[PDB]
Amino acid sequence: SGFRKMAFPSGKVEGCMVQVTCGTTTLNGLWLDDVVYCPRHVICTSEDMLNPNYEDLLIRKSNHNFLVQAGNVQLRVIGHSMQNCVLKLKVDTANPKTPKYKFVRIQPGQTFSVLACYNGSPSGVYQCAMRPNFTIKGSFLNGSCGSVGFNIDYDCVSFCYMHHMELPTGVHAGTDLEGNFYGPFVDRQTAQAAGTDTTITVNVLAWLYAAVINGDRWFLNRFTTTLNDFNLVAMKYNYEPLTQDHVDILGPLSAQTGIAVLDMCASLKELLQNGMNGRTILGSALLEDEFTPFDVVRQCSGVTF
Amino acid sequence: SGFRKMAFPSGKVEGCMVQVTCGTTTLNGLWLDDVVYCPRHVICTSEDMLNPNYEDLLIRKSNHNFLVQAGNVQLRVIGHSMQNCVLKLKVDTANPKTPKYKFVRIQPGQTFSVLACYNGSPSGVYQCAMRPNFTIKGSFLNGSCGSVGFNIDYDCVSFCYMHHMELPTGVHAGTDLEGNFYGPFVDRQTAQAAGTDTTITVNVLAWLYAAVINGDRWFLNRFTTTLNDFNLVAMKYNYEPLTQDHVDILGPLSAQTGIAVLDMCASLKELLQNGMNGRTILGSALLEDEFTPFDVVRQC
Ligand SMILES: */C=C/C(=O)O[C@H](C(=O)NCc1cccc(OC)c1OC)c1ccc([N+](=O)[O-])cc1
Numbered sequence: 344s345g346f347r348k349m350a351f352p353s354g355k356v357e358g359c360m361v362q363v364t365c366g367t368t369t370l371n372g373l374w375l376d377d378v379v380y381c382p383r384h385v386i387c388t389s390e391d392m393l394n395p396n397y398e399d400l401l402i403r404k405s406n407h408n409f410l411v412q413a414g415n416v417q418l419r420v421i422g423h424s425m426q427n428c429v430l431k432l433k434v435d436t437a438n439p440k441t442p443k444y445k446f447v448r449i450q451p452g453q454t455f456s457v458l459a460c461y462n463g464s465p466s467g468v469y470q471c472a473m474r475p476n477f478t479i480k481g482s483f484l485n486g487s488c489g490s491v492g493f494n495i496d497y498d499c500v501s502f503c504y505m506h507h508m509e510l511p512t513g514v515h516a517g518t519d520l521e522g523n524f525y526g527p528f529v530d531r532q533t534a535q536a537a538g539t540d541t542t543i544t545v546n547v548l549a550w551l552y553a554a555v556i557n558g559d560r561w562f563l564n565r566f567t568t569t570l571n572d573f574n575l576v577a578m579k580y581n582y583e584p585l586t587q588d589h590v591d592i593l594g595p596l597s598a599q600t601g602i603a604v605l606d607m608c609a610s611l612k613e614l615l616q617n618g619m620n621g622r623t624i625l626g627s628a629l630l631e632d633e634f635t636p637f638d639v640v641r642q643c644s645g646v647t648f
Numbered sequence: 649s650g651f652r653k654m655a656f657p658s659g660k661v662e663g664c665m666v667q668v669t670c671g672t673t674t675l676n677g678l679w680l681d682d683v684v685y686c687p688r689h690v691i692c693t694s695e696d697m698l699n700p701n702y703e704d705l706l707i708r709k710s711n712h713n714f715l716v717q718a719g720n721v722q723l724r725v726i727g728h729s730m731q732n733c734v735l736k737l738k739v740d741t742a743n744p745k746t747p748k749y750k751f752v753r754i755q756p757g758q759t760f761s762v763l764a765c766y767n768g769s770p771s772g773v774y775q776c777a778m779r780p781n782f783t784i785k786g787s788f789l790n791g792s793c794g795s796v797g798f799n800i801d802y803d804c805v806s807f808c809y810m811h812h813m814e815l816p817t818g819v820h821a822g823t824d825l826e827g828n829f830y831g832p833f834v835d836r837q838t839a840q841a842a843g844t845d846t847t848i849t850v851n852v853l854a855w856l857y858a859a860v861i862n863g864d865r866w867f868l869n870r871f872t873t874t875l876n877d878f879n880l881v882a883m884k885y886n887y888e889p890l891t892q893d894h895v896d897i898l899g900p901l902s903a904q905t906g907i908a909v910l911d912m913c914a915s916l917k918e919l920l921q922n923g924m925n926g927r928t929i930l931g932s933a934l935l936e937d938e939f940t941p942f943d944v945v946r947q948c
């Protein structure tokens with residue numbers, strides 16, 4: 344037993360990380376088959392980052408202005424192109440460690456693993472959620488740009504995130520691997536801020552089920568409620584609305600415990616109203632919202648990769 | 649910016665994970681060069697587990713009684729021996745993916761990453777610490793036995809833990825890779841209970857220095873304390889004694905923030921008395937004790 348913030352094993356992604364250098368700027372790239380993927384802002388200086396014309400800046404660039412190290416080995420760039428906010432550098436060598444993979448776009452509330460890297464060197468792995476305000480509460484020091492987020496299903500790596508920038512508030516913003524931003528952010532040094540964030544209700548409920556499965560049972564009560572009654576409480580405490588689809592997704596956990604989702608919603612209502620009264624749940628004084636229903640089932644079942 | 653519980657990249661350890669089977673028992677092994685390391689209790693039945701005689705159970709085994717499976721390939725066992733509580737199976741193929749590695753025995757307070765595995769297949773990676781009572785608060789289902797804990801410094805993997813068992817309290821006990829247990833635990837299903845768990849004081853201080861470095865000062869005060877007065881108070885909240893070693897180890901973070909160690913001790917004494925008053929420190933409403941001084945310097 345036990346319950347921990349758990350990342351996917353990062354080995355399939357470690358073998359894809361490379362260093363990309365454009366003159367003075369160095370950051371991380373993702374080498375899959377014969378293409379390296381990295382943030383397009385790699386082509387910008389201090390001058391440029393204020394108001395960049397990317398199509399213009401890029402049309403200036405020799406293939407040879409892109410220095411690409413896979414560990415201690417040079418890669419020959421034979422092509423450059425943009426898709427939205429990512430730069431695609433075609434190279435002469437396919438990555439022999441290319442895993443089975445795909446590019447997918449996640450919904451806010453979904454979780455993924457981030458391999459933090461510095462100069463194409465993987466440094467650490469942590470588990471994140473896409474916030475309702477489309478930011479991630481990451482740990483990134485300068486040169487982590489181009490670090491990626493992924494999920495693993497069986498043998499297949501699903502890449503969902505590439506890190507572009509930190510917001511003034513401490514949190515992080517980036518794109519899918521097709522270079523589409525998560526949230527209303529642009530790759531430019533302008534005034535940009537996070538919107539007011541909210542709590543991921545369906546995730547808090549998943550984590551209450553994890554606590555019950557682990558023997559932490561004190562917050563359960565005899566009461567039930569309704570979606571309408573609960574959502575009036577959710578809205579009041581800056582919680583995401585709970586939809587019928589959320590209830591359906593928690594179905595299995597409600598079967599395995601005996602606690603109907605609106606039964607557990609009654610528990611969460613009381614925790615929002617009265618607090619936790621000096622107690623903890625799974626060694627936490629806060630209601631954690633970065634575990635999905637699937638995260639709770641997978642960790643409390645034993646699924647491997 | 650931002651501060652998270654970070655684990656080491658797991659890839660160098662994933663390339664070492666195998667499945668070991670004896671009779672009807674299957675758990676994980678660690679394949680380094682031509683040796684597979686696993687818990688010796690892999691040779692026990694249900695009815696062996698109260699009073700097992702390992703040297704008697706083991707002498708009755710041949711090499712071919714041990715099935716070692718690395719992904720799809722069967723490894724051939726050509727030798728077996730026991731060292732303390734680990735079985736060492738010699739195989740005919742050296743692990744081509746063996747990293748640079750060493751075995752280290754860690755002290756309470758130290759952090760490491762765990763690669764949780766089932767049937768030789770990696771499930772997940774998380775960060776934890778050796779509790780003062782020599783247990784770890786891991787996440788481990790049946791068949792996770794043989795999962796290992798490690799640090800990576802440069803390209804060298806330091807193996808420091810192998811998982812053997814769950815105590816009745818839902819906390820986890822195990823050995824170094826020489827097969828000596830951390831704490832007073834034995835590989836028998838006899839009554840054994842971990843000592844009272846305490847908070848790792850030196851780590852909480854480290855994490856308060858981290859919070860100052862990320863620009864958070866609301867918890868500082870203008871008081872100082874003697875070491876002795878600090879320990880008299882902290883021990884009443886089940887905090888580990890702080891030692892002169894712990895004070896010297898915080899030296900660098902002291903000098904970085906310009907806050908003397910015993911001044912930061914005064915802050916923690918006050919935090920224990922008042923709680924947070926609806927505030928958080930680096931996103932926690934509790935005092936976090938699973939980051940070391942070394943982890944804080946590495947991540948800040
Ligand atoms: C490989 C994992 C495993 O099954 O090991 C045994 C174990 O830890 N028992 C499970 C257990 C014990 C107490 C309470 C429990 O439920 C809350 C559980 O189930 C999770 C195991 C292996 C070896 C020994 N030994 O002889 O030392 C003891 C137990």
Ligand SMILES: [Cl-]
Binds near residue numbers: 468
């Ligand atoms: Cl994590």
